[PDB]
Amino acid sequence: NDFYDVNDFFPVQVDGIESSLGKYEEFAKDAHEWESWNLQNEDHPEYPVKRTKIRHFTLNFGPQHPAAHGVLRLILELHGEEILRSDPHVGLLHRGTEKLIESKTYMQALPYFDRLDYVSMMTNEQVFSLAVEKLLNLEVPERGQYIRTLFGEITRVLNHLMSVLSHAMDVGALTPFLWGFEEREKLMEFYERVSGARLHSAYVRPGGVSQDLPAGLLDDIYMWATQFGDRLDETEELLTDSRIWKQRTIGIGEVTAEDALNYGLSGVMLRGSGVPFDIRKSQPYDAYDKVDFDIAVGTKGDCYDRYLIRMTEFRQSLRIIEQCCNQMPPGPVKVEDFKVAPPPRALMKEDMEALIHHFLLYTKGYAVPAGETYTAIEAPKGEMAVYVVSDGSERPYRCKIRAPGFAHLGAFDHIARGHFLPDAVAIIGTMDLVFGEVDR
Amino acid sequence: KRTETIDVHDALGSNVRVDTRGIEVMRVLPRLNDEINEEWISDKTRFACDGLKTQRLTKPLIRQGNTFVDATWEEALATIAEGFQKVQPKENEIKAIVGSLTDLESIVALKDLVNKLGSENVSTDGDATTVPPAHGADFRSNYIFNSTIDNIEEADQILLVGTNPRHEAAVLNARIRKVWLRSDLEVHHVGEEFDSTFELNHLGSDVNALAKALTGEVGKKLSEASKPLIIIGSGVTETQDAEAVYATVAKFVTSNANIVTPEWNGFNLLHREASRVGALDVGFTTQSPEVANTKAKFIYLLGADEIVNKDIPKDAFVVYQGHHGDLGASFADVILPGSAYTEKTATYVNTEGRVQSTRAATNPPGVAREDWMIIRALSEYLGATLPYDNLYEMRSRLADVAPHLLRHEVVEPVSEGIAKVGFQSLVKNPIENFYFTDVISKSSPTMAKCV
Amino acid sequence: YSSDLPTDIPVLSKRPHTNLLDYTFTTFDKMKNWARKSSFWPMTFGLACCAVEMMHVSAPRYDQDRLGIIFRASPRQSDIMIVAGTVTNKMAPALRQVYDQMPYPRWVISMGSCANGGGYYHYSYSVVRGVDRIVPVDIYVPGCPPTSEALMYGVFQLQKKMMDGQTHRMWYRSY
Amino acid sequence: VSTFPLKSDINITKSGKTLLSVGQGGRSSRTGFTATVFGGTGFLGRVVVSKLAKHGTNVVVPFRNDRARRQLKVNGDLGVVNFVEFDIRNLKSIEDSVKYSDIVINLIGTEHFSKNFSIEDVNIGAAERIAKAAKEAGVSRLIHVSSYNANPSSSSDFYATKGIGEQVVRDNFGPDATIVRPAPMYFRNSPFLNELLQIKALGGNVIFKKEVYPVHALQVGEAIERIAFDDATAGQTYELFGKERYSKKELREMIKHIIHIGYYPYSAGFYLPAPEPFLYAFALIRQYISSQPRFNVDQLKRSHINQEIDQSAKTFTDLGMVPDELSEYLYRYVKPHIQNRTVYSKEDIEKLRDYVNTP
Amino acid sequence: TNPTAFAQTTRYVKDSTEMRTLVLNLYRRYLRHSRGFVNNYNLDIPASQVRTKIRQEFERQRFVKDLPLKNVLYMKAQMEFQELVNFWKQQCHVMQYFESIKGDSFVQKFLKGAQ
Amino acid sequence: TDLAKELVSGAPKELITERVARIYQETETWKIDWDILNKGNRWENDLMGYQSSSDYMQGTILKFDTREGAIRFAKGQGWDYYIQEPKV
Numbered sequence A: 001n002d003f004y005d006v007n008d009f010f011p012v013q014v015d016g017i018e019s020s021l022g023k024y025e026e027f028a029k030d031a032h033e034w035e036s037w038n039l040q041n042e043d044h045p046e047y048p049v050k051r052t053k054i055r056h057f058t059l060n061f062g063p064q065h066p067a068a069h070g071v072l073r074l075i076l077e078l079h080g081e082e083i084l085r086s087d088p089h090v091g092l093l094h095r096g097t098e099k100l101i102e103s104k105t106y107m108q109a110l111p112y113f114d115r116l117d118y119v120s121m122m123t124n125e126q127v128f129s130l131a132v133e134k135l136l137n138l139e140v141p142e143r144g145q146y147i148r149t150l151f152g153e154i155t156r157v158l159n160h161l162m163s164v165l166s167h168a169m170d171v172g173a174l175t176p177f178l179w180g181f182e183e184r185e186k187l188m189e190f191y192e193r194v195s196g197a198r199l200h201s202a203y204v205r206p207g208g209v210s211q212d213l214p215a216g217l218l219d220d221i222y223m224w225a226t227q228f229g230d231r232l233d234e235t236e237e238l239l240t241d242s243r244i245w246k247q248r249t250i251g252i253g254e255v256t257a258e259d260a261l262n263y264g265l266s267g268v269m270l271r272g273s274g275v276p277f278d279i280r281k282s283q284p285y286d287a288y289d290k291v292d293f294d295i296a297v298g299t300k301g302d303c304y305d306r307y308l309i310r311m312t313e314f315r316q317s318l319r320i321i322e323q324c325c326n327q328m329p330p331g332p333v334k335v336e337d338f339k340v341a342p343p344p345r346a347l348m349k350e351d352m353e354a355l356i357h358h359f360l361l362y363t364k365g366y367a368v369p370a371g372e373t374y375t376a377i378e379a380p381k382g383e384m385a386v387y388v389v390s391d392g393s394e395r396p397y398r399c400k401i402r403a404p405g406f407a408h409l410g411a412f413d414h415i416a417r418g419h420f421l422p423d424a425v426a427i428i429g430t431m432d433l434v435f436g437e438v439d440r
Numbered sequence B: 001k002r003t004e005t006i007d008v009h010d011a012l013g014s015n016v017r018v019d020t021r022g023i024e025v026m027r028v029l030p031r032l033n034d035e036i037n038e039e040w041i042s043d044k045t046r047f048a049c050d051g052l053k054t055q056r057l058t059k060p061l062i063r064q065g066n067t068f069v070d071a072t073w074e075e076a077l078a079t080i081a082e083g084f085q086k087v088q089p090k091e092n093e094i095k096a097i098v099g100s101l102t103d104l105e106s107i108v109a110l111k112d113l114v115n116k117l118g119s120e121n122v123s124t125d126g127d128a129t130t131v132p133p134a135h136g137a138d139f140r141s142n143y144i145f146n147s148t149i150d151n152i153e154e155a156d157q158i159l160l161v162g163t164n165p166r167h168e169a170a171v172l173n174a175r176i177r178k179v180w181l182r183s184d185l186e187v188h189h190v191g192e193e194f195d196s197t198f199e200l201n202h203l204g205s206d207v208n209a210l211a212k213a214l215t216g217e218v219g220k221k222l223s224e225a226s227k228p229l230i231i232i233g234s235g236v237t238e239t240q241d242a243e244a245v246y247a248t249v250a251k252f253v254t255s256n257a258n259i260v261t262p263e264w265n266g267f268n269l270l271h272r273e274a275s276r277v278g279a280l281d282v283g284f285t286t287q288s289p290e291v292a293n294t295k296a297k298f299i300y301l302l303g304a305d306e307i308v309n310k311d312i313p314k315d316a317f318v319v320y321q322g323h324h325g326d327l328g329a330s331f332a333d334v335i336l337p338g339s340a341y342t343e344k345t346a347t348y349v350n351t352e353g354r355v356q357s358t359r360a361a362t363n364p365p366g367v368a369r370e371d372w373m374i375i376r377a378l379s380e381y382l383g384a385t386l387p388y389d390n391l392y393e394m395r396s397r398l399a400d401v402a403p404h405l406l407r408h409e410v411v412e413p414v415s416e417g418i419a420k421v422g423f424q425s426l427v428k429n430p431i432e433n434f435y436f437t438d439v440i441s442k443s444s445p446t447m448a449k450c451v
Numbered sequence C: 001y002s003s004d005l006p007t008d009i010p011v012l013s014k015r016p017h018t019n020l021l022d023y024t025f026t027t028f029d030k031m032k033n034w035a036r037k038s039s040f041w042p043m044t045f046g047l048a049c050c051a052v053e054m055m056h057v058s059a060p061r062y063d064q065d066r067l068g069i070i071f072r073a074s075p076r077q078s079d080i081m082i083v084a085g086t087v088t089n090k091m092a093p094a095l096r097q098v099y100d101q102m103p104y105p106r107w108v109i110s111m112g113s114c115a116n117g118g119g120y121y122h123y124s125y126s127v128v129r130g131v132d133r134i135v136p137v138d139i140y141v142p143g144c145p146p147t148s149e150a151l152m153y154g155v156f157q158l159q160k161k162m163m164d165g166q167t168h169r170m171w172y173r174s175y
Numbered sequence D: 001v002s003t004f005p006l007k008s009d010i011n012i013t014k015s016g017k018t019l020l021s022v023g024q025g026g027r028s029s030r031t032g033f034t035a036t037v038f039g040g041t042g043f044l045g046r047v048v049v050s051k052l053a054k055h056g057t058n059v060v061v062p063f064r065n066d067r068a069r070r071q072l073k074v075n076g077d078l079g080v081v082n083f084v085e086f087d088i089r090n091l092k093s094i095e096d097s098v099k100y101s102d103i104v105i106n107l108i109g110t111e112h113f114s115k116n117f118s119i120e121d122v123n124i125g126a127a128e129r130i131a132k133a134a135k136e137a138g139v140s141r142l143i144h145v146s147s148y149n150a151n152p153s154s155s156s157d158f159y160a161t162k163g164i165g166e167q168v169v170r171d172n173f174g175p176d177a178t179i180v181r182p183a184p185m186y187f188r189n190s191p192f193l194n195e196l197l198q199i200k201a202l203g204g205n206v207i208f209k210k211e212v213y214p215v216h217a218l219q220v221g222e223a224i225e226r227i228a229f230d231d232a233t234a235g236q237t238y239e240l241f242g243k244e245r246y247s248k249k250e251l252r253e254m255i256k257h258i259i260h261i262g263y264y265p266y267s268a269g270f271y272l273p274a275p276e277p278f279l280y281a282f283a284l285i286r287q288y289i290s291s292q293p294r295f296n297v298d299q300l301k302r303s304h305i306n307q308e309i310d311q312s313a314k315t316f317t318d319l320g321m322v323p324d325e326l327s328e329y330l331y332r333y334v335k336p337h338i339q340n341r342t343v344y345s346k347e348d349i350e351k352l353r354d355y356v357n358t359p
Numbered sequence E: 001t002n003p004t005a006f007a008q009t010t011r012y013v014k015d016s017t018e019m020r021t022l023v024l025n026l027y028r029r030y031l032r033h034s035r036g037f038v039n040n041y042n043l044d045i046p047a048s049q050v051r052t053k054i055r056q057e058f059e060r061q062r063f064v065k066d067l068p069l070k071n072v073l074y075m076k077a078q079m080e081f082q083e084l085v086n087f088w089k090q091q092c093h094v095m096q097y098f099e100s101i102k103g104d105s106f107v108q109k110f111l112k113g114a115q
Numbered sequence F: 001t002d003l004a005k006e007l008v009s010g011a012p013k014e015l016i017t018e019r020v021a022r023i024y025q026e027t028e029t030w031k032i033d034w035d036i037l038n039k040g041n042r043w044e045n046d047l048m049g050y051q052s053s054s055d056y057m058q059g060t061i062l063k064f065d066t067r068e069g070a071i072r073f074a075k076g077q078g079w080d081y082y083i084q085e086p087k088v
């Protein structure tokens, strides 16, 4: 039952027990003291053993753990050191973003998306910008889509540095964490020069970007590109061929390609299992068709494979950054429609038509024609998509966000079952969890 | 934030839209209603909004000497009862006066409190020389616009019985002017001389001018009119010859048959207060000159201001309940703050008999309560507790008063088979300053620029 | 009984040292506060996007370790608690359990908008509107997210407060 | 508490100020008062301050310890809880906490004299200065807390000074002042209980033979709250105590039995029979060698004096509150210090109490 | 994937009688864990008190009529059982669950402000 | 309509009884909002003049499509309500 619980040899009929001084029944009322007179052997499988159900050691991999990328009450049920069942408790960071967007305009709802994933900002707001652009039936000009491709790559480098190095740090390699974080400081300079804030760059707005690139940014972006090429090499020096790094990750968290599709995994934990699918290729967008790059596909579906794919994503992203700097076109950076973009300040105070649209954009907002859409992009974690329903109003009606880290954490039970408690950290690290995105 | 409610300055009760901001009303705009106003409101209504931001009574007040002091509700509801039995008023020594802006829920609920203490010196703050109203609260048709507003554009002859429609109902004044342009409209002036947007078939200034009207060509066209109009302003009952007015006219309404058809009623009233019709539809008026002569020892004012000609005894106990500090407030002894018309759900009745309520916009300022809620609160302090414990029950009481009181935005008329029986009962411009008419206008800083 | 309390004797934070004991117990306070001023060990309570900045202080560009700052995971080993990120209702009971386990002395720093007064999610059905409803706070760092220097500035101001502690002189003069 | 503490939304104080409360009684509501709670950082203050702030009354809490005032600000909203640094020897700082105050509460009271203050200087000298200074600033109401056995002629220093504290206030603040006498309160970290839970309690037989009338500290916390919002309760004397009579020795064995503390009580030091001169000598010696407030000579005398109810005063029911018994709350407050937990319910305390009295 | 302790499939029951028996077993399950809820959450109320409150909870809403709304009330009550037995709610929430809770005349409500 | 759905919506007990919802029409669709509270709807904060409020339904408006659709909803939730007919 709920609180406690209760054959090969032949069932042998023995009756008529006798001793040398009488029968079994003659001394029955006295033999309980005589331990050598008992008739219930203790080796019998049918012997009544009633033992209380003492629950197994359930350690809380709870919020106050450095391995956690947020506040995760990972209720782990373990016997010994193996993993029996895992039940993550997401929601400790449910800020209710989906509820708040319904009451704010399409321009005011953009800064919510930078706060989903703390590290992949300009990719997050790109998927809402594309969603609104798809409904608005307006297309960003060429130079706008090249800026989104360049900062699409820089964001991927920023995200993967947080993902790979913390995964390396959580294993125990402290040094590669600090070498890479200087590069993030160097990369966050580029975010701050174009947008103003280091981390949450409300830059990619529906209808292009916020402001044109500052002069000389390309020179500084390219100069970092030459130096950055060595940074991966030293990262691959202390991780790629080290035997301790291989032992911690090889064969840890095996995910079949057929089973990865079943749980809807996307991103690195779908090419780690061998499927050569990539959203940047399946649905080209924002000047990704123009550039050329090679996708990476694993063969064993374990953490070490996903590491190699993520490291390859560094060089392939750096490959595009060279192409985006070289192939940069001239022109505007946002759609030249005053109804979906603020007019320049030189013209707002000179032209009566310009001032009216500036006044009207910021008080009522632009109205999105009715419809519904589901646009998915290759986020650094995986397939990130938003389901947006337009009710002809200047405020979206329904905004459901597909978080790649949300689905992956669900497949923790399928992946981590049968591994050891140290392998739990490796599995979490390779999932690239950011519980702001999980609990959107 | 917008709310749809009604004006209380005049007796039209036109539909308006109020745009508030938190706990302050910013502007009032008209909301379309072809039945009453149709996009027009006078400058008085829309520029008296700021009158609710000053002079407000926010606390109970108690007189100690000759200056009011800030006192709680516990003491205020007791100082009335404490001094109530110090003087021990008799049956006719208790008086109640209801103001122009007092809502109908307080008007009905006050009678129950008054009756359980045995008094009948209750009426409005008018100056009707005849102690019972000349038209009388007996029948609805005696004091209502039986035509209603939507039955003016199809009239031929209109009689102004001592009135200034420009200064008495601006919305309807232009309605007559709009008809007067294209139609063959004929309007004759019988009353004090004035200045109008349009000329009239002017006669004179005396009552004896009307004596030769209904029998000459002035009244012959009234017989000729398929839909003739007779209008009696709020300035008639005040006059000395108010009794002569109804007998003279209703004799002309009981004579012809084209005046009163199954589709038309040629006789109407044009009051100017938003509480007179509500009073008459509930019988909140006296019916004896002797009772109006009593030197009452306890006069309980409920929104009443125009009481200068009302003989308030100096030794009497005067309690004023309202939402402003004005003429009626000085006479008080213990003041109970009420509620502004926008701050309450008050059921009002206009001069055409239409029952229009209000939707609450803001909370009452300070620690003010609802108008009637004080009376029931005051009831427990006098042993005359009323059985009404929520606003629905106050409307439940209105069900016993009449069936039309519970029909929102629905007008119950007087049937042609009975309104003629009510006709059988019968057989100087009242307003000085246009911008000083009601309590809110007098305290409005804006109207200080209209003088 | 006999009692006579003066009136011009000043408050502790304004009272100058007069005798030699007032210099002895000021030495103990500075020496003891200098230990806590330098060995400033917060707790890694990163919750949301504000947590990225708290990592970048440890990054080689700023290197919190140079100032004697070594984050300690366990509350027992940590004398500070930098509450960074949104504090949801589902977390608030847990946050109080973590705070109450810090041995005295203990300080709390509220970094970012969410920890201060609600921030972006102030009108959310499941967001505590300011962590000050749950734990006392000694310094508020404003930002979204506060720059890595803004947190260091907030750390420095709290350090300047700790160096103003006068506990062992308080026993001598105010107790 | 419930939902809104004020009896009426508008309350006029003795000074003519007309205070209007707003809101439905939440954290973001207000009451328009300003209750300066002297000694708010103490055991009793943290209950007095907490109740006043949550209902919207501004609290000005004068403190002398900087690190103890931080936790008092959680209770109120922004600007509700204010702080003033002060000392009883700094008159100017006293007048900073009463300038805007409509309610002044006095909780300052000590049992041990220090190298800076005597028992009189605090229960009188602080109280006299606080009360007289509050009057000069037009404070409408004063509330005071004294001992439960105040007596001007008592040989105990605490009771003698606390009694004179009642007189000196009424000669300074005037007829408006109120005096409230609380019985030994029991709550989390209550000084009344902290002596009973201590394992090494020298002179345990002598100290614990005293008698008391224990009262729940929450009710006394609300008792001041009820008095604060009412002007009808000026110039009174209130003694607050619990119905069922308990003695420390009855409690000490009752406390120990819940914690299940054979040989251990005889060895760890639960019962330490020591000579009366030794107890008197030990307290005197520590009085010059200790640095933290220890057992005092005064509490050696108080152990011989039992609690006395004064009939001139008024009980809880005068305020409309029924006092709660130690039986319904004694277990939970020692639950921190205690297979299957046995919860000693309200009635079962007697059955525990029965087991103590049986020889 | 392996479902957690004390889990049941979400099923739309299409019988009036079966739902009656499902509830009855459920009420016993709460009473069986009466001792645990006291020891797990360290509640101040003894075991008999919890059963008294549980009975007050089950007695309260026994008169519902809609079967489509019977399953919903049985589904969510199952979650309350699963959350409580698995020791998921924090200590504070259970303490406040049992710590929740006659009106006043019109004069009393008129004076202070009513609602 | 006959269903006591209020036991599954999780709404507080006060919505069923002490609140009134208006079904109005601002010009092609209908809306539902709750009438303001008697007291405590809006009090001026004494610190910074913020428009405080205890009513949690002040900011809620539901955009409907047809009148009978709105009435169906109000009966489904067990909401007290009244209907305001627009002027022609």
Ligand SMILES: NC(=O)C1=CN([C@@H]2O[C@H](COP(=O)(O)OP(=O)(O)OC[C@H]3O[C@@H](n4cnc5c(N)ncnc54)[C@H](OP(=O)(O)O)[C@@H]3O)[C@@H](O)[C@H]2O)C=CC1
Residues within 6 Å of the ligand: D038, D039, D040, D041, D042, D043, D044, D045, D063, D064, D065, D068, D087, D088, D107, D108, D109, D110, D111, D117, D122, D145, D146, D147, D148, D182, D183, D184, D185, D186, D190, D191, D192
């Ligand atoms: N159940 C109980 O606790 C008992 C209640 N009482 C009496 O009730 C009253 C409330 O005191 P209580 O809170 O319970 O216990 P505490 O001793 O902890 O209260 C002392 C309060 O007064 C302050 N205080 C003491 N001396 C000074 C001083 N020279 N200068 C400034 N402040 C001083 C303290 O400041 P700080 O703490 O910040 O240093 C503290 O705020 C006391 O008089 C107490 O004797 C009677 C018997 C027992």
Ligand SMILES: CCCCCCCCCCCC(=O)OC[C@H](COP(=O)(O)OCC[N+](C)(C)C)OC(=O)CCCCCCCCCCC
Residues within 6 Å of the ligand: C030, C031, C034, C163, C164
């Ligand atoms: C044996 C035990 C182990 C070793 C003990 C020593 C541990 C470290 C001590 C830290 C001291 C500290 O922190 O002193 C530095 C602090 C920091 O200045 P501040 O806090 O801003 O105040 C100072 C400014 N005022 C006072 C105007 C506000 O004060 C001082 O400048 C103290 C004054 C300098 C003292 C120099 C003379 C004494 C020399 C003694 C050594 C021979």
Ligand code: SF4
Residues within 6 Å of the ligand: A115, C048, C049, C050, C051, C084, C085, C086, C111, C112, C113, C114, C115, C119, C120, C143, C144, C145, C146
């Ligand atoms: S304050 Fe801004 S950066 Fe910090 S947690 Fe909140 S949303 Fe993120």
